Design a protein around this ligand. Sequence first.
Ligand SMILES: Cc1cc(C)n(-c2ccc(CC(=O)Nc3noc4c3CCCC4)cc2)n1
Length: 307
Amino acid sequence: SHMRHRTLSSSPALWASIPCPRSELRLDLVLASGQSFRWKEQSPAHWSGVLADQVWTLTQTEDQLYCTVYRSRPTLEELETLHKYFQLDVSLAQLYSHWASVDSHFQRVAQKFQGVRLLRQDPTECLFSFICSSNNNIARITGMVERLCQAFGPRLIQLDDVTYHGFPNLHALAGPEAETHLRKLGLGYRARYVRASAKAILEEQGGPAWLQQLRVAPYEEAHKALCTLPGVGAKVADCICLMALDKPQAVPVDVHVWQIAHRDYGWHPKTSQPSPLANKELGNFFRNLWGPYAGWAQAVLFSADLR
Ligand SMILES: Cc1cc(C)n(-c2ccc(CC(=O)Nc3noc4c3CCCC4)cc2)n1
């Protein structure tokens, strides 16, 4: 039978519910605010994309986050995977308070941008999503991640005129053919780096259990370990640390962070010398204003900066 992208209108039988205030999560602010690049609004206010090799459509009211899956409706198993994805364990309201009480600029911005939170992403997925492109702009990375998924990850399902592949496994990326293929897709020289990091993870660190150990490790160790990988520098490593390795204190520094720091906070390098040195300084700067969940505080201001 031909499968359509579902709505709350087309087939109510096929939806479960997670009790979730629109104060703790706005999907229109999280799913395409530069954290994950695999979610798409196919029909109005309905978010469809791949998660852990299963296709989901998501939507919400003021009370309830509504979920449907494409493999019948979601289990406890499958709803516990969304609960940990959105990190609903953590009270965002108790962060938007603590960030308010130290940051007057937050309190003004955070009126209009409620319910921005971090996703807990898959380490492999996140790592390769950030090394396949410049990270110039959301649209660039979103297209590259799709091309990458279309050619290296297994076909999963058709929905309307759209075919969903899963995120590539390390073996598909690590093969002796990977680069020449990846360069078809437009990755340029970053095709070298995609292969070599996959090769490195499988054949020198024990495969993805390595990244799970970094998730267990403290921030500094995982960062450092992430930078030994080809194609990974300081910004990408903090992205991964923040977004996949449970390091809320990570503050990935790039030219938008600089722009926000300077215009909105009055910040300049105390070194008096953008550089490796000064960027490290700016991330120290933000950790010390915002606290242990500093990245999550960045997330809000990034949503606010895209509008
Ligand atoms: C026009 C414009 C304005 C902005 C802020 N971007 C933009 C945003 C996002 C990305 C991808 C990226 O790098 N995301 C992140 N890096 O650190 C963080 C994130 C996401 C969550 C909070 C920590 C690229 C561009 N584009």
